[PDB]
Every structure is written in structure tokens, then in C-alpha cells.
Design a protein around this ligand. Structure first.
Ligand SMILES: [Cl-]
Ligand SMILES: [Cl-]
Ligand SMILES: [Cl-]
Ligand SMILES: [Mg+2]
Ligand SMILES: [Mg+2]
Ligand SMILES: [Mg+2]
Ligand SMILES: [Mg+2]
Ligand SMILES: [Mg+2]
Ligand SMILES: [Mg+2]
Ligand SMILES: [Mg+2]
Ligand SMILES: [Mg+2]
Lengths: 189, 187, 189, 187, 190, 190, 190, 190
RNA sequence: UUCGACGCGUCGAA
RNA sequence: UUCGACGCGUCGAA
């Protein structure tokens, strides 16, 4: 009797949404903690927090058997995961676009985009500490991310989430960071 | 090469989105025509449009392999179709909740609630025409749909979308119809 | 250390909000069921459901020790409780403004206002069943609720919730129901 | 007679709301003046305004007997006061989270975050004036406030209101300040 | 010293706004009161309220010297007062379009238009109670107000605020009240 | 030298635009006035106003030379002109979708949909005057317009813009009017 | 007979309103033009445009006879006129809050707050031209206006309307300008 | 039969909109590509893209027969194309304001204004790589664009879309790039 | 008052 | 946007 199939499926969904949300939130917390740790210098516990995030990502992936919901609310957490990963990889001098996760296209793309910001932050504090090498390396992975990711601008925005906006922000950041680099060079004399 | 997998999946999703949209639009056009036809008397021709809509729905059932879209896209046409089916069932004395489609829960629920206003317009036409038995029937199914759907209001709004609102509006319609029936009976 | 007092109080609040919301939601379900039952004729199980509501209201009142939140989210449930009660009392021919519950002024007032609608629904279906007595008595409690409640219009709206709007709706309903009464009289000949 | 109890409570609540509003407005005026004064150099006079604000806050502490309002009304003036306190602490080398007020959690958190912008404007003035040690200090406390507040972002937005946003904006401010400090050092 | 002038004029405007709002709200309370009394049957008490209201309008009038704020603020109360006067007049067999107050064209027109529905309410309650004569009278003043007011409907809405919506409502009320009257009339041949 | 031709075209468009705006505001005002006037039972005067409107429409059509701005701007007022025409046509016994003067597709469709509401007012006031046959005819045209215009929903918005929303409003109006018409069927008796 | 006087005043207000609108749109256009012109380094032409604006302000002030509509409407354009004047004054070495022609309090305050941003553009283009002293002066005035105008926040909005938002924007502008000025201090060298 | 005419013109407009959008988006893709290539150093491949784009514009031009829709639709692509052309021209030492395309004043002006920032990016990357001569050249074309474009800033915004904001950004970019250049210059005496 | 849509202006990421 | 807000001017909804 159809109404009871409704009631059933709605109870299932309410439950799933609650649990999923819990998991996704824990994942996000670990991603964020990871990023902050990397800014702080502690890359070891950054890798720890990261591993925690990914295990939780398997737990998250468990809920794909609820297509309605799922995709409407995975993105943010997924983005940060990618962001955090790319970010660690950049500062470890092992940056790759070859991150293999069961994540949505929008989230992959956008996570990479988001890393550009963290990179600007990093490159800027290193600029201040006098470490021009790390800065110019950061710069380089930034420009790489932008340049490669712009290729997906050709898609209708709705499919590719907030990609054009984020990339325009990135571009502004890259210019600011280059100016800062030059300024830091001339400053330190 | 990862990014290339992205590119490929986005090319697919774009294509799909476009065709799904086209098909959903056809489906909706048929649903709508069926409804307007029932209002116009042409109840059999209405049945034809409904049949078409349902076939097109078989064609829509293809795209669930794209869950990244699909639901988001299908909602409106879906609930439209449920509306048309419920309206047709109702006007022809065969009203039931037991329809075989599936159809997402919100689409289902919201379709039935949507039917209530259609039933009011019908009921009111019948009233002007003098057919009181028809208006009484419609009134009965309106009342039924309300009483029954209201049970699902326990749920968090998000999961069931606009349900509570659409129901309030329905209630309003039912009352206005009861009034319209009381007058007209003064004739 | 202040930050820890923050963290503590926020964990407390998140919890309380969750629980409170559950309780309130159950209360609302019983109120609503009560009302529908009364429309259906089954006033006995209406009184049952009602009693369930009120016990749950004691449970609700438990959370007053969280002033922030609480008042931001009690209203709706409280309103319906009052509404439901007034509604039962009207159709039992024992209508009173002397309902004694620990409930907010806005909710008391607004619940009574809301009853007017249920009453129009009721008086209308009785109008159709031929029962003019019940209808005119309903009408009378309607007009009573409006006239007594208008006296609180003198307050700034924010304090008295959606009172003016609801009362204007009520007034429209009263006029519609009177017209219906006359029309039902002449119809029935 | 119930309804009369309602009438009474509403008369009280109205009176209170009016008074509370007046007092909060006073408090906020003093907070604001204290901040602008610190920006202008007059750091002691600023201290005076801050003292006034806090006394007025003792007067505000009366109205918690009206929980039906109070919080809703107090939020803005509260977080503004926390902002002024944090800013004053910071500019005078005595920055700490340990302030004795309470003050609701969101008001607290959001007040500190709000301080970051004030610290940027200050830092930038100091920069133009040549006082690098001051900008370094401000930069340090901006960084601290960010690092520490960010921990509270775990919480559901509602409970902590605009925190995540105000922090993003803060981050932005900190970066722009770091840039402004790198230039100016080229002199 | 233009900033100090700003400060002066702003202080005055602030004060005036507080006082004016307090007065206005008293006037509106009294008007609403008198209308409710009229429905309630207590026409003398209604008269007293109407009187305290009209008394208040003299106080309100003092604020014309602040034209920024004055016309924006006075509208609802003025309209409400006009409504109460036209309504009371209607039921006392003394209906007149010659209400001579210092009030805006908007408040005047809108007040009568508003009175139309207060009248529908009245006419329906008399109709229930078997008092057909009262109903017929009310319906006549209703129709007269509609008829006289419909010509201002060519003026730009901003100049005559909600006039068209009000008159729409009036139209419907008239239609419904006529119907109700006729139905009740047949109803009392049995 | 291109920058030059830019400055030239730009100046031309500035001036045209200002004029086109003035003329459109006038045309729109006269159309509205005409409809209001019909409702105020001043049919002749309404005729005059509609004349002034249609005469402005030629001054307007002069600006098709500037397609960078003509279609973007002309919409509202052309909608209003269609509404006024369709309405006059309907109450004048000869209702038809054949009004010879275009006008963009969307303004035509929107204008008719809009006219549905004016028809509602008119039918209501017929009902009040006791002219049931007239109100019947109005209901009929209203329904017709709804039925024919619904066929255009299939097209995308933007291209057709406001239509869906307008038509929903219209549907509401029609039903409301039916309800009122039913309420009046107590005559019939007397 | 009151309905009569209504019709009269209403007609008067209709006509006045249309004219007042036309004159305000003009005055506003000329003020904006003047500011634009200064930025385009055409200072004399900007002088002309400002003249045309101030001359329209008298045509405008004729309408104070209609306080039902005067203050509601004049706001925007009087704000733009203040902005243009304050701006011209500042870049012309004699900045002062003493501009002799009023104008409502809120339009004055808002106009100056508005002028802060134009000052930002100007200081930026000075910086580009290498005139650091000039940009310094601009920074100083900007800061002054911010400081003085903040003292008016205590008042309620509405009375002061847009001020708080404008001033926040202004604060942002000032800081941005400071940052730019700092970035330029690499000259200094050469 | 006016409804059937509506249906016809609407069908045509719908089709045209689909086709046009497809074309426009191809042109835009190509322009964006050519710009990215220019930054990437691959100026020949950039030239090829620019060529495919300009080829497309000939297709786009065919849609002028649908003025409803045409001008609303073509703006962003046209602007993007102009930007790409002016940018490529700038780095190839062949900068010219004489770009002779059938394109709106808005697209033209806005395209150059847009190119300013693309230029700032370029100038900064050469500046990093020690190529001071390229930077100086870029800064010169930047300043020339700003200077000639600033006079259109007197035109109403709607007629010349985002021109003001674009030029604001330009101003700042110029200011920053000058600073950067000077800083890098001192930086290479060590 | 509340909401939405269009046009006219000014902001902001703005 | 494009996007978000403000105010004027129109028009519809509650
Ligand atoms: Cl570090
Ligand atoms: Cl029953
Ligand atoms: Cl060409
Ligand atoms: Mg991040
Ligand atoms: Mg339907
Ligand atoms: Mg209820
Ligand atoms: Mg501050
Ligand atoms: Mg009234
Ligand atoms: Mg109309
Ligand atoms: Mg300006
Ligand atoms: Mg670009």
C-alpha cells in the first residue's frame, strides 16, 4: 500500500540524513584540523588527521544507496577533503592532480580551487619568515592549479558548482602573492 | 588521468541533463494537457495524454544512472504527473492512493495535494452546471486527500518539501468549496 | 578559563535544543491529532491525545533553564496546545478563556485566535449536515474569541506575535460563516 | 482572570523592552566611542568610555527577569562591548580571552572576531606612522584570535550565529595586513 | 555651522517622532475602540471614544511643522479615525461626506472605503438577527460610498495609497451583502 | 576612428533613451487611466484616454531604430496597452484576439492575461448591478483567454516572461468570480 | 464639498509630482556627470554641469509647497548634489562641511559619506600620477568625514536612513586607500 | 490571426535562441582560450584561437534579425572577444584602438577595460622573470587604455554596462603594477 | 505594513 | 551574472 511505502522511505531518509550529517561533520572537522596543522608546521599530525578524514570518507560513501539526499549534501565535506589533501601535497613538494577518491567532479575541482587560498596564506607567512624558496614553490603550484582548472570553465556553472567564482578569487590571490614576493625581496636588503 | 575522468563525467552529465530536461518537458506538457482536457469534458482524450505522459516516464526512468542530477531535475515533472493521475482517478469515480509509479515521496505527496485545487475548479464547474452529485463526490475526495496527507506533516519540512503549506492552501480550497456548494443548493 | 566556559555552554545548548525539539514535535503531533479527532467526531480519543500533549508540556517546561533558545522555539507547539484545548472546549459547550498553562502570552493569545479557523471548519460541516444549532453556537464562540482578543491589538506587534494578521483572517472567516449560515437556512427548505 | 495576567505581563514586557533598549543604546554608544578613541590616540579617555559601558552593563543585567526578550535584544550591544574590550586589551599589550563579563557565547565569540578588523585598521595606521613593532604585535593577536576561534566552527551555525563568515572575513583581513606590512618594510 | 545645524534639526525630529507616535497611537486606539463599541451596540460609549480621538487630532496637528516625518507618520491613524467617524455616522442615520478634518486626501478616501467593510460586517449581523431594515440602510450607504469613491481610482496609486485594493474589497463586500440580504429575505417567508 | 563612432552612437542612445522613457511613461499612464475610467462608469472619457495612448504608440514605434534599447524598455507599457485594448474589446461585445497593432509576442500574451483581472472587477460590478447575463459573458471570455493562453506555457520563460505567474493569478480570479456568481444565484428568486 | 477639495488637491499633486520627478532626474544626472567629469580630468566641464545642477535645485525647491510629496521624493537627488559639492570642494583645496544650500539633514550626511568613495578614486589616480602629497590630503579629508559623520550614528536610522551602511563602505574605502598608499611608498626610491 | 502569429514568432525566437547561444558560447570559449595561450607564451596558438573566434562572429551576426533577444544575448561574448583581441595586440607590439568589429559600444569599451587587468597579470609575470622591458610596455598600453576610456564614464551606466566598475579595477591595477615595477627595479640593483 | 516581478538610480562581492 | 542589498517609479499576491 503506497502510502506506507512513502512513510517507510521517509523514515529511512530522515534517519540516513541524520547519520550522514554526523559523519560528514566529523570528516570536515578532521580536514580543517589537518589544514590548520599544516599552517602550524606540524605536518606529521596533519597526515594523521588526514588519514582519520579518509577513513570517515569510507563511512560517508556508505550512504550512496540514498541518491536523493547524498549528493545534495556531500559536497562541502568532500571539497575540504580534497582541498586539505592537495594542500599537504603541495607543501611536501609532491603535488598531484592524481588524487584517487570516490568524490564528485564538482568537489574535486572545487577542492583544488580552494587550495590556492591556503597556498597564498602559506606563501605569505613564509615570505615574512624570509624563506623565498618555499614561497616561489607555492606560487608555482598555485599557478598550476589555476591554469589546469580553468579548462573546466567551459561547463555550465551549475554542474561545476562555484568554480568560476572561486577561480577568479584564486587569480586575484596569485597576483597579490606575486606582488608580495617582489616586495619581500626588495624589503629584505 | 583523474582530471580527464572528471572531464568525461561532466560531458556525460551535461548531455544527460539536456536530454532529461527535454523529456521531462514533454512529459509535463502531456500531464498538463490531460488535466485541461478533463476540465473541458474531453475525458477520454485526456486519458490519451495521460498514457503518453506515462510512456515518457518510462523513458525518464533511464537517467537514474545519473543520480548527481535526476532527482533535482525530475521533482517538478514527477509531482505534476502524480497530480494528473490523481485528478483523473478522482473525476472518474476510481480515486485511490494506490498508483504504481514511484516517483519520489515528496513528488507523490505533493502531487496529491496539488490535485485538491484541480478538484475544486472541477467541483465548481459542476456546481454551476447543476451536477450536485459530482461536486459532492469531489468534495469527498478532497476531504480524503487532506485527512490522509496531513499524517505526513509529522516529518521535517525539508524531506517532504512544501507539504504543510500546500496542505493549508488545500484546506482553504476545501472550505471555499463547501461554501460554494451550500449556495447553489439554494436553487 | 572563559573559552572553556563557552565550549561547555555551547555543548549544553546544542544538546538541549535537540531534545527540546523532539519533545515539542511530539507535543505538536498530539495537539494536531486531537484537533483532527474532534473534526472527526471522536471527542473521547481527542481528550486522550490532549492529555498526552499536556504531559509532554511538563516535559517541555523542563527546558526553561535555557532562556536563550527556549522562547525562540516553544511558541508554535504551545500555540497549538492552546488552540486544540480551546477547540475541544468550544464544541463541548464549555468554552473558557481560563485555561491555566505555563505558556507564553503570545502563544496563549495566538492559540485562541487560531481556534477561530477550526471553528469555521466545524460550523461549516455541521451547516451542511443540517445541524444549525451547533453552527450558531460555534459562530457565537468565534465572535467571542475575536471580540475579546482584539483588546490586545493595542500592543506592539512583535510582542504579540502574528496577532493582528490572525485576527483579520478570523474576522473574514466569521463573515464567511455567517453568510454560509443564512445560505444554509434558505437552502434547506 | 488569565487574560488579565496576559495583559499585565505584556505591559511589563513592553515597558522593559523600552528601557532595555535605551540602556543598551547607551552602552553601545560608549563602546563605540571607546574604540574610535583608541584609534585616535586618546587611549586613557577610551578607558573611561569602556568603564562607563561596563557600568551600564551592570544596569542591563537587571532585565534577565524578562527572558522572553533580553537575549534577543542584548546580542548586538553585548558583542559590541566584547569587541571594545578585546580591542583595548590588544592595543595595550594585555590581550587575553579571559575577560569577566558573561555575555552569551555567540556575543563573546563574535565580539572577538569583530575585533580583528579593528586591529587591522590600527595596524595599518601604525604602519603608516612607522611603528613596526606595534603592527607586529597586532598581527600576532589577529593570528591568535583566528587560530583559537576557528575551533568553535565545529558548531552548528545557528548556535554561534555568524561565526564562520566573520572568521573568513577576518582571515582576509589578516592576509591583507601581512601584505601591507611587507610593503612599508620596504622603506 | 552646518553639522551643528544637522545635529539640532535631527534632535528636534527625533523628539517630535517619539511624541507624535505616542499621540497617533492613542488616537488610533480610540478609533478602533469606537468602531468595536458600535458593533457591540454601545453607541454612546462609541461616541465618547470618537470624541477623545478627534480631541487628539488637535494635538497631532501641532506636528505639521515637521513635514519630513509628519505626512509619512500620520496616515494610518488619520485613515482609522475617518473610518470610525463615517461608520458611526452610517449607523446613526447621519451619514455625510462632509467630514471636515485636516487630513490627507489619501486618509479621507481610504477611510470611507475602509468603512465599507465594517458596514458589511454590521449589515450581516443585523441580517442574522432578522433586522432587515438596518441591513437595507447599511447596504445603501455602502453602495453610495463605493459609487462616490470609484472616480478617484484614476489617480496614481502613490497619491492615494491603497485605494484601489480597498475598493476591490468593497465591491466584493457589496456583492456578497446583497446576496446575503436576498437569501435571508426568502429565508423569512418560512 | 571607432572610439569616435562609439561616442557618437552612445550620445544618440542617451538622448533617444531619455525621450523613449518619457513617452512610454505617458502611454502607460493613459492606458491605465482608460481602464480605471471604464470601471468608474465614464466610458466616453476612457475612450479619449485610450485614443491618447494609441497615438503615443506611434511616437514610440519611431524608436525601433535603436534595437539596443527598444525591446528592453518597451515591454511594460506595451503590455499595458494590450491590456487596455483587450479589456475595452471584451466589455464592448466584440471580444477577439485580433487587435491590429503589434507589439512584441510577450507583451500581447501578458496584456491579455492581465485583462482577465479587469474582467473580474467588471463582472463583479455587473453582478452587483443585477446584470447576470453580462457577468456570464465575462466569465466566458475570462475562461477563453485562460484556455488559449495556457497553450503558450510550453515555451521557455524570459521569451514569454511573466505569463505563467499572470495566468495563475488569472485562474484564481476566474474561480473567485465563479464563486461570486454562484453566491448571486439567490436571484433566481425575485 | 470635501470630496471636491480632495479631487482638487489630488489633481494638483498629480501634476506637481510629474514635474518634480522630471526636474529631479535632471538635477541628479547633472550632479553625477559633474563628478564623472572631474575624474575624466575635464574640470571646467564638470564646473558647468555642477552649475546646471545647482540651478535646477531652485526649480526643485519651488515644490516645498507640497510637503505630502516633497520630502519623500527629493532625497536621492539632494544626496547626489551634496556628494558632488563636497567632492568638488575637497579636491579644490578648501574642504569644509560648510556648503551653503540646504537640503535635508540625511541628504547632507549621506552626500558627504558618499563623497568618501569619489575621494578614494581621486587619491588613487593622484597616486598613479605620482602626486603623493595630494593623495595624503585626500586621505586626511576622507578620515575627517568618517570621524565627524560617525558621531551621527547614535540617532535612529530612517531619520538618518542609509548612513551606517554608507559609512561602513567608506571605512573600507579609506583602508583600501591606505593600503594602496603604503604600496606606493616604494617611492621614496626614485 | 494574431495568436498564430504569436506562436510563429515565438517558435522562431526559441530556435534562434538555442542556435545563437551555442555559437556565442563557442566564440567565448575560443576567446578565453586565446587569452590563456597568450599568458602561456604560445602566441601562434593564441592567434589560431582568435581567428576561430572572429570567424564565429560572422555566424553570430546573422542573428541581428531577432532584435528582441539579440542584443541581450550577444554582450558577454562580444566583450570577451574584444578583450582577447586587444590583449593579443598589446603583447604583439601592435596595440590599436581601431578594432573594426560590428559590436556594441558597451562590448567595445568594456573589452578594452577588461584587457587592462589581463595586462596587469602579464606585466607582473614578466616583472618576476626579470623582463622589465615587457613590463614597461604593458604598463604603457594599460595607461593609454585607462586614459582614453575614462571619458565614456559620463554615459549612463545602463548604456555602457559595467564600465565604471571595470575602470575602477583598472585604476587600482595600474597603481599596483607601477609600484610592483619600481620595487622590482630597486630589487635588481642587488 | 508583508512578499514578488519589471523599469530607473546608487552601492557591494562581492 | 551574472549575484546581493538600498531607494524611486510601475504592477500584481497575501
Ligand atoms: Cl611557518
Ligand atoms: Cl460530525
Ligand atoms: Cl565584423
Ligand atoms: Mg580553506
Ligand atoms: Mg494544476
Ligand atoms: Mg489549526
Ligand atoms: Mg568595529
Ligand atoms: Mg476596518
Ligand atoms: Mg490592470
Ligand atoms: Mg558616487
Ligand atoms: Mg579577463
Amino acid at each position: 500500500m503506497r502510502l506506507e511505502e512513502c512513510r517507510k522511505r521517509l523514515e529511512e531518509l530522515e534517519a540516513a540524513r541524520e547519520e550522514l550529517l554526523k559523519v560528514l561533520r566529523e570528516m570536515r572537522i578532521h580536514s580543517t584540523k589537518s589544514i590548520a596543522l599544516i599552517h602550524a608546521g606540524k605536518v606529521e599530525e596533519a597526515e594523521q588527521e588526514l588519514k582519520k578524514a579518509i577513513e570517515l570518507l569510507e563511512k560517508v560513501k556508505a550512504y550512496r544507496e540514498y541518491p536523493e539526499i547524498y549528493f545534495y549534501l556531500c559536497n562541502d565535506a568532500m571539497q575540504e577533503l580534497v582541498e586539505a589533501i592537495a594542500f599537504k601535497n603541495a607543501i611536501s613538494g609532491e603535488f598531484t592532480f592524481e588524487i584517487d577518491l570516490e568524490v564528485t567532479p564538482a568537489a574535486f575541482l572545487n577542492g583544488f580551487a580552494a587550495a590556492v587560498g591556503e597556498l597564498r596564506r602559506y606563501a605569505l607567512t613564509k615570505l615574512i619568515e624570509g624563506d623565498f624558496k618555499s614561497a616561489e614553490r607555492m606560487l608555482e603550484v598555485m599557478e598550476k592549479i589555476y591554469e589546469r582548472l580553468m579548462e573546466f570553465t567551459t561547463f555550465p556553472d551549475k554542474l561545476v558548482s562555484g568554480l568560476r567564482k572561486k577561480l577568479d578569487v584564486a587569480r586575484g590571490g596569485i597576483e597579490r602573492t606575486k606582488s608580495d614576493y617582489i616586495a619581500a625581496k626588495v624589503a629584505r636588503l
